[PDB]
Design an enzyme around this catalytic site. Structure first.
Site, PDB file in Angstrom:
ATOM      1  N   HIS A  26       0.847  -1.186   0.000  1.00  0.00           N
ATOM      2  CA  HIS A  26       0.000   0.000   0.000  1.00  0.00           C
ATOM      3  C   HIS A  26       0.888   1.243   0.000  1.00  0.00           C
ATOM      4  O   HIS A  26       0.652   2.192  -0.746  1.00  0.00           O
ATOM      5  CB  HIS A  26      -0.910  -0.068   1.240  1.00  0.00           C
ATOM      6  CG  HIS A  26      -1.569   1.222   1.624  1.00  0.00           C
ATOM      7  ND1 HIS A  26      -2.927   1.320   1.830  1.00  0.00           N
ATOM      8  CD2 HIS A  26      -1.053   2.433   1.946  1.00  0.00           C
ATOM      9  CE1 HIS A  26      -3.220   2.533   2.265  1.00  0.00           C
ATOM     10  NE2 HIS A  26      -2.101   3.230   2.346  1.00  0.00           N
ATOM     11  N   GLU A  27       1.924   1.231   0.830  1.00  0.00           N
ATOM     12  CA  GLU A  27       2.870   2.335   0.840  1.00  0.00           C
ATOM     13  C   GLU A  27       3.580   2.486  -0.503  1.00  0.00           C
ATOM     14  O   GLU A  27       3.747   3.596  -0.987  1.00  0.00           O
ATOM     15  CB  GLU A  27       3.893   2.153   1.970  1.00  0.00           C
ATOM     16  CG  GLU A  27       3.281   2.266   3.355  1.00  0.00           C
ATOM     17  CD  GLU A  27       2.276   3.410   3.448  1.00  0.00           C
ATOM     18  OE1 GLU A  27       2.444   4.412   2.717  1.00  0.00           O
ATOM     19  OE2 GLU A  27       1.322   3.313   4.250  1.00  0.00           O
ATOM     20  N   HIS A  50       1.205   4.066  -3.009  1.00  0.00           N
ATOM     21  CA  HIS A  50       1.248   5.525  -3.049  1.00  0.00           C
ATOM     22  C   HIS A  50       2.414   6.025  -3.914  1.00  0.00           C
ATOM     23  O   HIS A  50       2.225   6.916  -4.752  1.00  0.00           O
ATOM     24  CB  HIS A  50       1.360   6.100  -1.632  1.00  0.00           C
ATOM     25  CG  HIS A  50       0.064   6.114  -0.883  1.00  0.00           C
ATOM     26  ND1 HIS A  50      -1.132   6.471  -1.469  1.00  0.00           N
ATOM     27  CD2 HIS A  50      -0.222   5.823   0.408  1.00  0.00           C
ATOM     28  CE1 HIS A  50      -2.098   6.398  -0.572  1.00  0.00           C
ATOM     29  NE2 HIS A  50      -1.574   6.006   0.575  1.00  0.00           N
ATOM     30  N   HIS A  93      -5.747   6.678  -1.852  1.00  0.00           N
ATOM     31  CA  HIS A  93      -6.640   5.753  -1.170  1.00  0.00           C
ATOM     32  C   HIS A  93      -7.911   5.560  -1.989  1.00  0.00           C
ATOM     33  O   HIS A  93      -8.348   6.457  -2.714  1.00  0.00           O
ATOM     34  CB  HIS A  93      -6.997   6.264   0.220  1.00  0.00           C
ATOM     35  CG  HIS A  93      -5.847   6.254   1.172  1.00  0.00           C
ATOM     36  ND1 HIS A  93      -5.502   7.349   1.933  1.00  0.00           N
ATOM     37  CD2 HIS A  93      -4.946   5.288   1.467  1.00  0.00           C
ATOM     38  CE1 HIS A  93      -4.436   7.057   2.658  1.00  0.00           C
ATOM     39  NE2 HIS A  93      -4.080   5.813   2.393  1.00  0.00           N
TER      40      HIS A  93
HETATM   41  C1  LIG Z   1      -2.700  -4.743   7.365  1.00  0.00           C
HETATM   42  C2  LIG Z   1      -2.820  -3.742   6.212  1.00  0.00           C
HETATM   43  C3  LIG Z   1      -2.930  -2.964   5.314  1.00  0.00           C
HETATM   44  C4  LIG Z   1      -3.160  -1.956   4.131  1.00  0.00           C
HETATM   45  O1  LIG Z   1      -2.197  -0.913   3.976  1.00  0.00           O
HETATM   46  C5  LIG Z   1      -2.340   0.206   4.803  1.00  0.00           C
HETATM   47  C6  LIG Z   1      -3.591   0.572   5.327  1.00  0.00           C
HETATM   48  C7  LIG Z   1      -3.684   1.630   6.233  1.00  0.00           C
HETATM   49  C8  LIG Z   1      -2.522   2.318   6.614  1.00  0.00           C
HETATM   50  S1  LIG Z   1      -2.659   3.609   7.793  1.00  0.00           S
HETATM   51  O2  LIG Z   1      -3.596   3.202   8.797  1.00  0.00           O
HETATM   52  O3  LIG Z   1      -1.316   3.989   8.178  1.00  0.00           O
HETATM   53  C9  LIG Z   1      -3.482   4.874   6.834  1.00  0.00           C
HETATM   54  C10 LIG Z   1      -2.808   5.070   5.489  1.00  0.00           C
HETATM   55  C11 LIG Z   1      -1.609   5.993   5.606  1.00  0.00           C
HETATM   56  S2  LIG Z   1      -0.561   5.814   4.159  1.00  0.00           S
HETATM   57  C12 LIG Z   1      -1.265   1.970   6.097  1.00  0.00           C
HETATM   58  C13 LIG Z   1      -1.179   0.908   5.185  1.00  0.00           C
HETATM   59 ZN   LIG Z   2      -2.198   5.273   2.500  1.00  0.00          ZN
END
Ligand SMILES: CC#CCOc1ccc(S(=O)(=O)CCCS)cc1
Ligand SMILES: [Zn+2]
Ligand SMILES: [Zn+2]
EC number: 3.4.24.86
Length: 259
Positions: free
Chosen positions: A190-191, A194, A200
């Site tokens: 996910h990081e 980005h 998101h």
């Molecule tokens: C287990 C799992 C997963 C999915 O990936 C993310 C979801 C939320 C976040 S958080 O809460 O830091 C909000 C996004 C900030 S980039 C950070 C990464």
């Molecule tokens: Zn994020």
């Protein structure tokens, strides 16, 4: 136009700070490195299987080019800060930095190195407030954007030098625990999502944030997914449009062959 393979890999600088070294690698260079090698490879599987234009534009992903393991905390003078320093900043009482602050600091300190690679990424072990797992700068196709894949010089001037915002970070500690490895995989997915240009998933768009009986949320959902629903480790169509726009462009810029 078809995926020129000579440029289908974002090369990574991977950095384990002393915290990650101590608590994930158990104070061993080998155990630390293998954790990260195996993780990046598993994350790569998800990227490379993603057909960004839902057609032939696929086989793109990531690969470690350099691993930096900081076995001990960074010596620092009063006033000074460094992302690998022993105390958390700003509030030194907490387990962890303010995450925005951390990502900035890392981007400053790792500037020289980040210039040489498509992305730099910190892996750390600290318990950010509010269930925060990591953070990264969103990439963009725009000829003059900042953040994400491909080093592009920006003059701070908080730091008084060129920095590259081709960065992001992952923490393997959350609410007083080591997160599961299947959860780390998703945080870094996910990081790096980005970095690769994804925002998101919008909560409204039913199509890109489905209900549970549709397979649940995708990996770019703003709130962490539990990981067991069909969609959890995958990219939504929203993410794919955003990332395709960034990649179609930035790949020619700095993606490479697998090395
Ligand atoms: C287990 C799992 C997963 C999915 O990936 C993310 C979801 C939320 C976040 S958080 O809460 O830091 C909000 C996004 C900030 S980039 C950070 C990464
Ligand atoms: Zn994020
Ligand atoms: Zn936390």
């Amino acid at each position: 136009a078809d995926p020129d393979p000579m440029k289908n890999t974002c090369k990574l600088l991977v950095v384990a700070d002393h915290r990650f070294y101590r608590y994930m690698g158990r104070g061993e260079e080998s155990t630390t490195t293998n954790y990260l090698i195996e993780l990046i490879d598993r994350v790569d599987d998800i990227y490379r299987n993603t057909a960004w234009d839902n057609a032939g534009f696929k086989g793109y992903g990531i690969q470690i080019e350099q691993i930096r393991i900081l076995k001990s905390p960074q010596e620092v003078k009063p006033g000074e800060k460094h992302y690998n320093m022993a105390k958390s900043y700003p509030n030194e009482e907490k387990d962890a930095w303010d995450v925005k602050m951390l990502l900035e600091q890392f981007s400053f300190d790792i500037a020289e190195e980040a210039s040489k690679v498509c992305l730099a990424h910190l892996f750390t072990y600290q318990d950010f407030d509010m269930g925060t797992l990591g953070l990264a700068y969103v990439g963009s196709p725009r000829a003059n954007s900042h953040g994400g894949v491909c080093p592009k010089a920006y003059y701070s001037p908080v730091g008084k030098k060129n920095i590259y915002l081709n960065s992001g970070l992952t923490s393997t500690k959350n609410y007083g625990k080591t997160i599961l490895t299947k959860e780390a995989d998703l945080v870094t997915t996910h990081e790096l999502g980005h970095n690769f240009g994804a925002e998101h998933d919008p909560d409204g768009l039913a199509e890109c944030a489905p209900n549970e009986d549709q397979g649940g949320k995708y990996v770019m959902y703003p709130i962490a997914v539990s990981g067991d629903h069909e969609n959890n480790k995958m990219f939504s169509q929203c993410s794919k449009q955003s990332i395709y726009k960034t990649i179609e462009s930035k790949a020619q810029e700095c993606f490479q062959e697998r090395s």
